Write a protein that binds this DNA or RNA. Structure first.
Ligand code: MG
Ligand code: MG
Ligand code: MG
Ligand code: MG
Length: 52
RNA sequence: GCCCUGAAAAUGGAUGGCGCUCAAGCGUGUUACCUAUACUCUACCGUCAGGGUUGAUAUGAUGCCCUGACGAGUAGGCAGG
């Protein structure tokens, strides 16, 4: 009642809870998604070999 | 050309000094040698630029790592402590 829900309006006049600018807080799962993984090129060595 | 005369100032006095006369002087030529915080190569610190790396089961993706270049400073500005 005090702060409101998705089906109940908040008792505060004209107030709604703030929105999210990102859907989830774990970007690891977003990267590990099939669509992202199927569009990227293979990665490197993570520690480049010294050539000269 | 060199040297000499012309050429007199006040504390004692300065090719920097000693001293030097086929010079250790003057003109000219040939080599060797000495040494700057400059140049060349290397290491280390920092700054700037271009890049690599999220895949869990280990901690900083403002992380870790690869590559190149650069570094004087009053008044003054900005940044990290
Ligand atoms: Mg001579
Ligand atoms: Mg030097
Ligand atoms: Mg310099
Ligand atoms: Mg400086």
């Amino acid at each position: 009642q005090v702060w409101g829900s998705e089906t109940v309006a908040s008792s505060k006049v004209g107030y709604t809870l703030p929105s999210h600018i990102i859907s989830t807080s774990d970007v690891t799962r977003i990267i590990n998604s099939s669509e992202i993984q199927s569009a990227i090129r293979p990665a490197g060595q993570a520690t480049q070999k010294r050539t000269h």
